[PDB]
């Protein structure tokens, strides 16, 4: 099996940037290599084959070149549309395979987050379960810190985070994070917090609120 | 105009066989090119599992070919997977692609693909929880609401909202593994205007339990 590599798996730019993709063969491959466009919901476009060649319909700022082992994608003036992972495929002999893939981020303005607490439902602790939740909404960038503080102290243990991809249309994050425990810790302890740290701020931003109201 | 999408069962058991089957539209099977099953793996590992040839001829992956059986009926213009003995490694998204038979071997069209799971793990209906401010929480602008919707397997899940504006933005965040069983959650905000007078609830439908829950939120 030809093994390919994309020593790059994270790539981060500005739009109307010039961006490369690099792809890597175990072995001479002569020129069959193909590009794929795979974007979050999972829909996959054939971008460029034989190198260099543009699949009918793909944007002439789309281009690849290369020989041997070594082969390269050039996106360049990067566009809003083009937030995706590139994989780069051998087609010389069977099996044919696959890279790793490059995520490919635009950059942004950076972004505070916009932070909510919501505390367990009336349902949910009839059921016997207590859950709080934290939105931490359209943020950049993508790098942020959430702790739990239950009446003031430190939670690690039953935190369940969740990232969305970047936002197609205003280059964008968010995330959530949820808290659970039973309905008896739960009652035990008035205050729950939610600290969210990011680069946009030096100190936190803290949302909580308190049983006892 | 050419169009393939795929559809089988998403959940089956350790050990039993994958069926699969692509539906090709906008172009025979018979006339030309390769039609071909794929499938990418956690982690973004994308591996070719086969194809059959409009003539045809059938090729596997060697790594696969002691479980692996493509057929076709030209008749639906259908082509199928199966894949036997299936272990939880086996847990992937589907994909099936129409290729070059031969010459540059570049997939020209391909599915949407479908995620397909091995587990013995029982299917659930999930439990629905609004997520509304509480009380004390006096607010500005525009307000956040949400789902919880908790305990369910398989994956998948949709989520949709109604309010009455079409300023709405939301977001859905991907599901997560909760000792078994999935947990998921979706956001919305609106104009603090908007709530509570117009009326804002979540639908959560689930497939595999078929099953909709419809929660209003309330202050």
């Known amino acids: 099996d030809i093994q390919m590599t994309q020593t790059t798996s994270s790539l981060s730019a500005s739009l109307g940037d010039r961006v490369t993709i690099s792809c890597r063969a175990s072995q001479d491959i002569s020129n069959y290599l193909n590009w794929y466009q795979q974007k979050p919901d999972g829909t996959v476009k054939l971008l460029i084959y034989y190198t260099s060649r543009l699949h009918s319909g793909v944007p002439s700022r789309f281009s690849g070149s290369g020989s041997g082992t070594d082969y390269s994608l050039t996106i360049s003036n990067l566009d809003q549309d083009d937030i995706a992972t590139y994989f780069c495929?051998?087609?010389?002999?069977?099996?044919?395979?696959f890279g790793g893939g490059t995520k490919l981020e635009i950059k942004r303005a950076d972004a505070a987050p916009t932070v909510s607490i919501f505390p367990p439902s009336s349902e949910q602790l009839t059921s016997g379960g207590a859950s709080v939740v934290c939105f931490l909404n359209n943020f950049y960038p993508k790098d942020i810190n959430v702790k739990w503080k239950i009446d003031g102290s430190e939670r690690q243990n039953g935190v369940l985070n969740s990232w969305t991809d970047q936002d197609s249309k205003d280059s964008t994050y968010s995330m959530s994070s949820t808290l659970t425990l039973t309905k008896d810790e739960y009652e035990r302890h008035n205050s729950y917090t939610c600290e969210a740290t990011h680069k946009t701020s030096t100190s936190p931003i803290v949302k909580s609120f308190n049983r006892n109201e | 105009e050419v169009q393939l999408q795929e559809s089988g069962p998403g959940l089956v058991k350790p050990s039993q066989s994958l069926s699969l089957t692509c539906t090709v539209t906008?172009?025979?099977?018979?006339?030309?090119?390769?039609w071909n099953w794929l499938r990418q793996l956690p982690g973004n590992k994308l591996e070719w599992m086969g194809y059959i040839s409009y003539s045809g001829r059938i090729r596997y992956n060697p790594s696969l070919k002691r479980r692996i059986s493509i057929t076709r009926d030209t008749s639906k213009n259908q082509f199928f997977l199966q894949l036997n003995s299936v272990t939880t490694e086996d847990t992937a998204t589907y994909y099936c692609?129409?290729?070059?038979?031969?010459?540059?071997?570049?997939?020209?069209?391909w599915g949407q693909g479908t995620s397909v799971t091995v587990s013995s793990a029982k299917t659930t209906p999930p439990s629905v929880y609004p997520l509304a401010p509480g009380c004390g929480d006096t607010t500005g602008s525009s307000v956040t609401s949400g789902c919880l919707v908790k305990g369910y397997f398989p994956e998948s899940v949709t989520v949709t909202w109604n309010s009455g504006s079409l300023s709405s933005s939301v977001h859905t965040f991907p599901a997560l593994l909760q000792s078994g069983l999935y947990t998921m959650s979706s956001s919305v905000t609106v104009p603090s205007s908007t709530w509570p007078s117009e009326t804002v609830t979540c639908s959560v439908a689930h497939p595999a339990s078929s099953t909709t829950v419809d929660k209003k939120l309330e202050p």
């Open positions: 906008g172009y025979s099977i018979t006339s030309d090119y390769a």
């Open positions: 495929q051998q087609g010389t002999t069977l099996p044919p395979t």
């Open positions: 692609a129409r290729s070059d038979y031969g010459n540059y071997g570049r997939g020209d069209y």
